[PDB]
Structure 1
Amino acid sequence: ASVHGTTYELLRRQGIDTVFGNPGTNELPFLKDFPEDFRYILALQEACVVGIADGYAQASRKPAFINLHSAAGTGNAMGALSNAWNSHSPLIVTAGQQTRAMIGVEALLTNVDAANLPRPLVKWSYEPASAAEVPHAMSRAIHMASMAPQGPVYLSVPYDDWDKDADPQSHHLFDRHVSSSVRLNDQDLDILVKALNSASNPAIVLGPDVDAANANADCVMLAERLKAPVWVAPSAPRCPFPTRHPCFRGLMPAGIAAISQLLEGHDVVLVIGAPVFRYHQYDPGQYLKPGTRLISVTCDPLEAARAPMGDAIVADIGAMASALANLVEESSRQLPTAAPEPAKVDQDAGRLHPETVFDTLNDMAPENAIYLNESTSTTAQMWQRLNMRNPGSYYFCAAGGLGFALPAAIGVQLAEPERQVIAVIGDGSANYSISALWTAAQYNIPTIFVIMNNGTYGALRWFAGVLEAENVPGLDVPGIDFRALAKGYGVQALKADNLEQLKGSLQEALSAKGPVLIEVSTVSP
């Protein structure tokens, strides 16, 4: 067998059937004779390729396979990899290298010092020392991406390797099964359970790895048993809990002092599937107030090591959430009372308040909608105004890197064909990966894109206020016609200048058979 044949067999035997890519010369010998049971999803720039693959992996809860062109293609994707690292996305990033005989001279298309290029944003990065090693190296890539803590990996392959003879012993790779589905030993788990049972006022904080693990329902059971309020850890990349459940308390402010104040009076704070903590603004103070102790369950040693406070347990989130939910006592305390509905913001017949947009989405969208957020100044109101009952209902660029939501929404929609995806994206953010729209059109992936157009980088105006910064250039983005951009890439386009038009546009978008972009005129901050 050839390295080509053996590698595709390994991929299919490990559950991979889709290649997200933008092709190039070094990759042609990999992509030729493309297997009929695989699909290839083309995107027009590599940030888009990786964003789409990332949304697909996160929603599908399995690895996604990517093929990029050498150094330039890999480089175009590195902002996307920054998000993927923070979301623990299992991405297998492959890139083609020059033919081995031309690497030394650094011919055009040579990826120099290739394994170092995507560092430090990958778990593992490698170029094999021979063609026959390629299937083994691919096996390593698959498992490194897939083992807890999941994350992106990188494999560079010289283009002449694919036609070479494979090692017959590579067949042992095909059906390898690697598990990291582990939980704390019985003795120490009993100690933890006792501590939870004995807490007088426990609180629970959940991060993105809960949703990645589909541990949401177990966390609901855990919170109900403990009669404990539940927050989402700050800078949330996913939604780990039903947002109208009586225990839900919303998104934590991303500040040191704000969080310790919030947790004051809680004797035991159990954090599951989150870093401790992904702060954002500089809000100095106490990490925790006296009387509060913290226990973190995380899938990631790097998270456990860097937490500035608390104990930690490094284990699988799914396994730990299930064990805890089933072992803790039913507390006789009263179940927390549900948060009140948010207020309706006054809205005239002109430009839309973001609050109005979210209220209307919540009114009109199906109960199993999936939202993405890259509308950076409106995140708090989005979290308060969307009822998200189900797992996998929310995605936000995990490293804050813009250019995620537009392509990721296409990948999520591909992963979840029966759940309507609605990406709410600011006018500034929409540009970073604008060309991703084309992929939705070409493959008829019916994502809805809601562009919040206020003409400015609103979040930067806000932070400029906080940091007390005057005379900052480059904050405004006037003169972009998003309907024309959508037309450019073949996506149906609508425009909503007021509430009447917003409702009409959403009605038409929800009924449409393909992707739709709605440009919404929102109020200037």
Structure 2
Amino acid sequence: ASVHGTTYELLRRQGIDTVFGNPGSNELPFLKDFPEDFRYILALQEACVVGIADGYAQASRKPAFINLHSAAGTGNAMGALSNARTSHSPLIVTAGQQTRAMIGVEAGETNVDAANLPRPLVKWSYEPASAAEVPHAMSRAIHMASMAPQGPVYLSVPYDDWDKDADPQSHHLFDRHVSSSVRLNDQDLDILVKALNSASNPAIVLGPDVDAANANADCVMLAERLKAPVWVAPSAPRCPFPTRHPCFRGLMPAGIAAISQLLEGHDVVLVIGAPVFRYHQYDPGQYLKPGTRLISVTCDPLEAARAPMGDAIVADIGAMASALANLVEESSRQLPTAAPEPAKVDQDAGRLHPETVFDTLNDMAPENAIYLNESTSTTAQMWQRLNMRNPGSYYFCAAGGLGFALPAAIGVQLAEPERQVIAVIGDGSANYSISALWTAAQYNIPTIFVIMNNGTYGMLRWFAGVLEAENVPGLDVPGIDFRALAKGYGVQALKADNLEQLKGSLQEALSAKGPVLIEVSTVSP
């Protein structure tokens, strides 16, 4: 048995059947003799490769296996890896190293000081000291990505290892089951339950690790029993709660004073599967107002440590949420009132307001639609106007790194073939990972890409306003033809310059068998 054979046996035994990658010389000895039960998804740039794997990993709730070329390939993917870290995405990142004999003289394609390259974004980074170690290194990689808190890992492999004899004792790796499905002990759980039952005006804040766990239904159960309003934590990479449920209060303000003021009057605030908290607007003030106690359930020690206030419990979100919801008493308090219908905004038969685009998608798109967002100006309106009833219905770059939603959209669609993926992407964001379009076309992945063309980096023009920053160059991105780029990568090119054109374009893309791009003319503020 070779290192090659043993590695592919371990992958399949660990439930991996897919390889996301961009090939190169150092990967050919791993990629040759490709098993019939595996499939390779090619992307044209390593940002795109990882972004696709990311979406696939996040929607599947399983490890995604990546294979990149040396330093240059790993490097090209580092922005994408910055999103995977905050996402807690289980990404197994492998990269071909030059032969052991050639590393010393630093021959072309040598990854110098390989394990340092992807730091500090990965939970684990390693290059084995012998070819027989490679399978054992892969085992650690697989388990390091899948254990709470989940995240990207990095394995560098000299290309001459693949053909060498595997250690026969590597077979003990194949069926290893590692569990982190843990929850607070009975004594301390009862105390926390007793404090939730005796809370007067309880409040709940939910983050991406709830949607990752598919703890959504258990959190609905909890919010009903406690009769408590539910917010999503700021800079939300995912949606952990039905957005039209009576308890849902929508997206939290990203400011310190704003959140404290919001939370004032709530005696107990239970945060689940979110950092405390991903602020971005610097709006200073009190973290919490007097009378408000905060308890945080997180899968990430880092999150527990950095919280500027409140108690924390480090545990698996599924296990905690399941236990919390079954143990908690039924309050005789009244269920909070559903949020009102959004205002229909003023719309002429010219350029489309984003508010109009979102209303149209809510009306036309399937009830089990999956949305992705890289339209940075319009995030608030999209959370208000899209009714997302089910889990895994929203993805947004977790560390704010643009070039996620386009490839990720393809990865989600591949992971969820029965669910229509609709990526709403700003004219600016579309360019970062534009070559990802090709993959949707080559593997007939029917992702819909909705380009919001306001001819500008709108979120930055807004930020410059708040900052009162004038004479900033490079805020405008005119002279981009998105129908020409879609055609460039073999993706069907529709347009919508008005409401009737958007209704018809949408209707067309829904029933289209392949990927469709819709270039939307939107109002420039």
TM-score, normalized by length of structure 1?
A: 1.00
Deviation readout 1:428-465 (Å, 9 max, x if unpaired): 00000000000000000000000000000000000001
**Post-superposition shift, 1:416?**
0.2
Deviation readout 1:339-383 (Å, 9 max, x if unpaired): 011000010000000000000000000000000000000000000
**Post-superposition shift, 1:295?**
0.2
SS at match of 1:412: helix
Deviation readout 1:197-233 (Å, 9 max, x if unpaired): 0000000000000000000000000000000000000
**Post-superposition shift, 1:85?**
0.2
Deviation readout 1:261-320 (Å, 9 max, x if unpaired): 110100100000000000011010100001101000000000000000000000000000
What does 1:267-346 align with in structure 2 at a 5 Å threshold?
A: 267-346=267-346
**Post-superposition shift, 1:478?**
0.1
- Aligned equivalents of 1:302, 1:244: Cα separation in 2: 32
- Aligned equivalents of 1:251, 1:153: Cα separation in 2: 31
**Post-superposition shift, 1:47?**
0.1
- Aligned equivalents of 1:286, 1:92: Cα separation in 2: 40
The answer to whether 1:217 aligns with 2:217 is yes
- Aligned equivalents of 2:468, 2:167: Cα separation in 1: 63
- Aligned equivalents of 1:359, 1:253: Cα separation in 2: 22
Deviation readout 1:307-342 (Å, 9 max, x if unpaired): 000000000000000000000000010000100110
- Aligned equivalents of 2:196, 2:479: Cα separation in 1: 55
Deviation readout 1:132-189 (Å, 9 max, x if unpaired): 0000000000000000000000000000000000000000000000000000000000
Deviation readout 1:453-497 (Å, 9 max, x if unpaired): 000000000000111100000000000000000000000010100
- Aligned equivalents of 1:480, 1:291: Cα separation in 2: 53
SS at match of 1:269: strand
- Aligned equivalents of 1:439, 1:82: Cα separation in 2: 22
- Residue 410 of structure 2: aligned partner: 410
- Aligned equivalents of 1:133, 1:142: Cα separation in 2: 14
- Aligned equivalents of 1:297, 1:467: Cα separation in 2: 35
- Aligned equivalents of 1:364, 1:288: Cα separation in 2: 41
**Post-superposition shift, 1:7?**
0.2
SS at match of 1:162: coil
SS at match of 2:160: helix
- Aligned equivalents of 2:220, 2:403: Cα separation in 1: 32
SS at match of 2:366: coil
- Aligned equivalents of 1:49, 1:262: Cα separation in 2: 40
- Aligned equivalents of 2:460, 2:262: Cα separation in 1: 26
SS at match of 1:86: helix
- Aligned equivalents of 2:147, 2:96: Cα separation in 1: 24
SS at match of 2:250: strand
- Aligned equivalents of 1:101, 1:466: Cα separation in 2: 56
- Aligned equivalents of 1:105, 1:335: Cα separation in 2: 70
SS at match of 1:286: coil
- Aligned equivalents of 1:258, 1:512: Cα separation in 2: 44
- Aligned equivalents of 2:111, 2:379: Cα separation in 1: 39
SS at match of 1:161: coil
What does 1:171-190 align with in structure 2 at a 5 Å threshold?
A: 171-190=171-190
Deviation readout 1:395-415 (Å, 9 max, x if unpaired): 000000000000000000000
Unaligned runs of 5+ in 1: none
- Aligned equivalents of 2:353, 2:305: Cα separation in 1: 42
- Aligned equivalents of 1:309, 1:147: Cα separation in 2: 26
SS at match of 1:357: helix
SS at match of 1:477: coil
- Residue 254 of structure 1: aligned partner: 254
- Aligned equivalents of 2:184, 2:196: Cα separation in 1: 15
- Residue 56 of structure 1: aligned partner: 56
- Aligned equivalents of 1:491, 1:264: Cα separation in 2: 50
- Aligned equivalents of 1:399, 1:303: Cα separation in 2: 14
- Residue 166 of structure 2: aligned partner: 166
SS at match of 1:160: coil
Deviation readout 1:18-58 (Å, 9 max, x if unpaired): 00000000000000001010000000000000000000000
Unaligned runs of 5+ in 2: none
What does 1:3-152 align with in structure 2 at a 5 Å threshold?
A: 3-152=3-152
- Aligned equivalents of 2:271, 2:85: Cα separation in 1: 20
- Aligned equivalents of 2:500, 2:34: Cα separation in 1: 49
- Aligned equivalents of 2:414, 2:231: Cα separation in 1: 30
Kindly report the root-mean-square deviation, in angstroms, between the aligned alpha carbons of the 2 structures.
0.3
- Aligned equivalents of 2:14, 2:38: Cα separation in 1: 13
Structure 1 residue ranges (4+ consecutive) displaced by more than 6 angstroms after TM superposition: none
- Aligned equivalents of 2:466, 2:129: Cα separation in 1: 52
SS at match of 1:51: helix
Aligned residues: 525
- Aligned equivalents of 2:221, 2:434: Cα separation in 1: 41
- Aligned equivalents of 2:120, 2:211: Cα separation in 1: 25
- Residue 388 of structure 1: aligned partner: 388
**Post-superposition shift, 1:242?**
0.1
- Aligned equivalents of 1:281, 1:25: Cα separation in 2: 45
SS at match of 1:490: coil
SS at match of 1:290: coil
**Post-superposition shift, 1:16?**
0.2
- Residue 492 of structure 2: aligned partner: 492
Deviation readout 1:89-123 (Å, 9 max, x if unpaired): 00000000000000000000000000000000000
TM-score, normalized by length of structure 2?
A: 1.00
- Aligned equivalents of 1:341, 1:235: Cα separation in 2: 23
**Post-superposition shift, 1:74?**
0.2
SS at match of 2:40: strand
- Aligned equivalents of 2:494, 2:315: Cα separation in 1: 47
- Identity value in percent: 99
- Aligned equivalents of 1:294, 1:467: Cα separation in 2: 31
